[PDB]
Design an enzyme around this catalytic site. Structure first.
Site, mmCIF file in Angstrom:
data_model
loop_
_atom_site.group_PDB
_atom_site.id
_atom_site.type_symbol
_atom_site.label_atom_id
_atom_site.label_comp_id
_atom_site.label_asym_id
_atom_site.label_seq_id
_atom_site.Cartn_x
_atom_site.Cartn_y
_atom_site.Cartn_z
ATOM 1 N N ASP A 95 0.802 -1.218 0.000
ATOM 2 C CA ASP A 95 0.000 0.000 0.000
ATOM 3 C C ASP A 95 0.823 1.251 0.000
ATOM 4 O O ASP A 95 0.463 2.259 0.649
ATOM 5 C CB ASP A 95 -0.877 0.001 1.246
ATOM 6 C CG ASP A 95 -1.785 -1.192 1.322
ATOM 7 O OD1 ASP A 95 -2.195 -1.666 0.270
ATOM 8 O OD2 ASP A 95 -2.164 -1.629 2.433
ATOM 9 N N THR A 117 -5.785 5.863 -2.603
ATOM 10 C CA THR A 117 -5.156 4.553 -2.740
ATOM 11 C C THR A 117 -5.017 4.156 -4.208
ATOM 12 O O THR A 117 -4.004 3.635 -4.597
ATOM 13 C CB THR A 117 -5.921 3.475 -1.983
ATOM 14 O OG1 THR A 117 -7.292 3.506 -2.358
ATOM 15 C CG2 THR A 117 -5.832 3.719 -0.509
ATOM 16 N N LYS A 131 2.318 4.672 -0.718
ATOM 17 C CA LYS A 131 1.749 5.920 -1.254
ATOM 18 C C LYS A 131 2.404 7.107 -0.574
ATOM 19 O O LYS A 131 3.125 6.943 0.418
ATOM 20 C CB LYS A 131 0.231 5.927 -1.104
ATOM 21 C CG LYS A 131 -0.292 5.868 0.303
ATOM 22 C CD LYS A 131 -1.777 5.502 0.309
ATOM 23 C CE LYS A 131 -2.301 5.270 1.711
ATOM 24 N NZ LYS A 131 -1.865 3.897 2.075
ATOM 25 N N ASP A 178 4.263 1.643 7.759
ATOM 26 C CA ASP A 178 3.226 0.636 7.514
ATOM 27 C C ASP A 178 3.722 -0.640 6.786
ATOM 28 O O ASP A 178 2.906 -1.485 6.412
ATOM 29 C CB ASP A 178 2.005 1.205 6.807
ATOM 30 C CG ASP A 178 1.099 2.039 7.744
ATOM 31 O OD1 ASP A 178 1.264 1.970 8.982
ATOM 32 O OD2 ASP A 178 0.206 2.742 7.201
ATOM 33 N N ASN A 235 2.507 7.516 3.190
ATOM 34 C CA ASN A 235 3.324 6.618 3.947
ATOM 35 C C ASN A 235 4.771 7.032 4.002
ATOM 36 O O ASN A 235 5.597 6.320 4.527
ATOM 37 C CB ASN A 235 3.210 5.203 3.372
ATOM 38 C CG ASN A 235 1.885 4.573 3.696
ATOM 39 O OD1 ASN A 235 1.341 4.790 4.739
ATOM 40 N ND2 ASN A 235 1.357 3.868 2.812
HETATM 41 C C1 LIG Z 1 -0.251 11.281 10.333
HETATM 42 C C2 LIG Z 1 0.202 9.865 10.662
HETATM 43 C C3 LIG Z 1 -0.999 8.939 10.790
HETATM 44 O O1 LIG Z 1 1.094 9.397 9.633
HETATM 45 C C4 LIG Z 1 0.872 9.856 11.843
HETATM 46 N N1 LIG Z 1 1.911 8.855 12.018
HETATM 47 N N2 LIG Z 1 1.698 7.509 11.837
HETATM 48 C C5 LIG Z 1 2.769 6.920 12.350
HETATM 49 C C6 LIG Z 1 2.898 5.436 12.465
HETATM 50 C C7 LIG Z 1 2.686 4.620 11.355
HETATM 51 C C8 LIG Z 1 2.860 3.278 11.427
HETATM 52 C C9 LIG Z 1 3.268 2.666 12.620
HETATM 53 N N3 LIG Z 1 3.452 1.309 12.634
HETATM 54 C C10 LIG Z 1 3.828 0.793 13.777
HETATM 55 O O2 LIG Z 1 4.049 -0.549 13.850
HETATM 56 C C11 LIG Z 1 3.707 -1.362 12.712
HETATM 57 C C12 LIG Z 1 4.283 -2.727 12.833
HETATM 58 C C13 LIG Z 1 4.922 -1.730 11.911
HETATM 59 C C14 LIG Z 1 4.045 1.498 14.967
HETATM 60 C C15 LIG Z 1 3.869 2.835 14.939
HETATM 61 C C16 LIG Z 1 3.472 3.468 13.759
HETATM 62 C C17 LIG Z 1 3.275 4.863 13.651
HETATM 63 C C18 LIG Z 1 3.699 7.838 12.812
HETATM 64 C C19 LIG Z 1 4.958 7.893 13.452
HETATM 65 N N4 LIG Z 1 5.641 6.814 13.798
HETATM 66 N N5 LIG Z 1 5.489 9.087 13.749
HETATM 67 C C20 LIG Z 1 4.791 10.181 13.456
HETATM 68 N N6 LIG Z 1 3.610 10.271 12.867
HETATM 69 C C21 LIG Z 1 3.120 9.079 12.566
#
Ligand SMILES: CC(C)(O)Cn1nc(-c2ccc3nc(OC4CC4)ccc3c2)c2c(N)ncnc21
Length: 461
Positions: free
Chosen positions: A133, A173, A135, A154, A138
């Protein structure tokens, strides 16, 4: 030893946003002070695709992986209702939001961005983890620094969790998905295709596969044909077009690998003379602004329906609780009823434990204007708990409208509405219908308030 509880170790500070599969919350370790970004996946709302042990093994591997262009995972927790994925926080926001904020952008800048993406993807594929996915949203910048590294988010999730079918989750998407993903037989090459589409967009500001709504876009992708005939392609090197062609090769076995794309002439040359791609930046600013407004419109309508729902639920709960029938509850009762409202709606990741609910109730109880302690009028509490959210929602919609209205005209034309509602996947005849009922003067344009009224009428108000 005890199975570890997420909220025993972390407290929530603020919601960072909705991402794929769940909300992400900025959290803080209760002992060490370390900040982290926690993706919380609701088991009610997100179905698993693999068995628990398959998921556990993938988590354990992800915790061991380390690459500068991949989000770092630290910890994993699971309770009855949720999975809690604790990763490193990044503060530089989404790549495309940084890009539209600069005056110059060249193939050198694009190559440097793509190289990072390819480096991340290459590492993940060596370890047999596929994104699927991929994009622009991400792609996060590590920090607010001009030079900041890109962190891909992700990886690994699509293998284990089913995507939402809701359009608020699906905006954007379609442009990026590999044709083979649509038909069911896919492998790690799908991530090269996605990267190819991102690169095409970086260099021209237009998606290679485009159309008026989701299904039209998917129809273009599935056929696989695209061109470089747009004028802005004349400022672009032939080697960039070659790399794109190879990345957007239809049959996956004939498509270039991530690793091989790193050794491509374009990457080698342009990361090791070069005009600004001004038209591309313009087109990206317009594409981004259109995407964010469609998203904002969907979130606004969804927030309005959630408010109709929760307002009535919360009133029935307090009415039940109000044994005197006198309309008065104490703080503890408002808290318990606001909790029961969470014991069903599993929407509010930020109400993570009893302490966060206490705080939120108190913001409203402080907000009850002037305070008498004991006999809170619950009907007025419901109004302000929900009006707060309603006000917030209105303000977020407005911000997106203003950013889209780049000429500060105050208006969106009906041509622009068509583009927005197409991306939002709102039926053409249906929004034209609601536009007729609002615009009774055939101005063929709407101001903010009129636009907001159209949205209210498109969600049953
Ligand atoms: C706007 C947003 C939804 O992208 C916010 N976002 N999304 C994530 C995000 C995105 C994905 C994340 N995935 C995780 O574990 C999965 C097994 C891999 C754990 C935390 C995750 C956090 C993120 C971040 N790390 N730092 C800052 N902003 C973040």
């Amino acid at each position: 030893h005890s199975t570890a509880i997420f909220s025993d170790r972390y407290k929530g500070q603020r919601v960072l946003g909705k991402g794929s599969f769940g909300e992400v919350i900025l959290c803080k370790d209760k002992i060490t002070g370390q900040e982290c970004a926690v993706k919380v996946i609701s088991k009610r709302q997100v179905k698993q695709k693999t068995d628990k042990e398959s998921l556990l093994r993938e988590v354990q591997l992800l915790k061991q992986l380390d690459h500068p262009n991949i989000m770092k995972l630290y910890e994993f927790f699971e309770d009855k209702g949720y999975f809690y994925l604790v990763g490193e926080v990044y503060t530089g926001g989404e790549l495309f939001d940084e890009i539209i904020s600069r005056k110059r952008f060249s193939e050198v800048d694009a190559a440097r961005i793509i190289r990072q993406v390819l480096s991340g993807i290459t590492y993940m594929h060596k370890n047999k983890i596929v994104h699927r996915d991929l994009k622009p949203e991400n792609l996060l910048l590590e920090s607010k620094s001009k030079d900041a590294n890109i962190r891909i988010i992700d990886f690994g999730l699509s293998t284990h969790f089913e995507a939402s079918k809701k359009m608020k989750d699906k905006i954007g998407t379609a442009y990026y998905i590999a044709p083979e993903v649509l038909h069911g037989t896919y492998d790690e090459k799908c991530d090269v295709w996605s990267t190819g589409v991102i690169l095409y967009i970086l260099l021209s500001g237009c998606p290679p596969f485009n159309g008026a709504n989701e299904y039209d876009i998917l129809k273009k992708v599935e056929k696989g044909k695209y061109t470089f005939e747009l004028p802005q392609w004349k400022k672009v090197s032939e080697s960039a077009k070659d790399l794109i062609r190879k990345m957007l090769t239809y049959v996956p076995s004939m498509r270039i690998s991530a690793r091989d794309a790193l050794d491509h002439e374009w990457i080698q040359t342009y990361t090791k003379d070069v005009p600004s791609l001004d038209n591309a930046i313009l087109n990206i600013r317009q594409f981004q602004g259109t995407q964010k407004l469609a998203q904002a419109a969907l979130l606004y309508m969804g927030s309005k329906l959630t408010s109709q729902d929760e307002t009535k639920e919360l009133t029935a709960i307090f009415h039940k609780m109000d044994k005197n029938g006198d309309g008065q509850l104490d703080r503890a009762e408002l808290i318990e009823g606001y909790k029961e409202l969470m014991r069903m709606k599993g929407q509010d990741a930020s109400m993570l434990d009893a302490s966060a609910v206490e705080h939120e109730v108190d913001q409203v109880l402080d907000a009850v204007d002037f305070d008498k302690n004991g006999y809170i009028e619950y009907s007025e509490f419901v109004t302000v708990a929900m009006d707060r959210k309603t006000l917030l929602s209105r303000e977020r919609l407005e911000r997106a409208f203003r950013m889209f209205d780049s000429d500060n005209s105050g208006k969106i034309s009906s041509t622009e509405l068509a583009t927005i509602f197409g991306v939002s996947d709102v039926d053409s005849e249906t929004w034209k219908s609601v536009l007729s009922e609002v615009d009774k003067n055939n101005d063929g344009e709407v101001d903010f308030d009129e636009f907001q009224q159209m949205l209210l009428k498109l969600c049953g108000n």
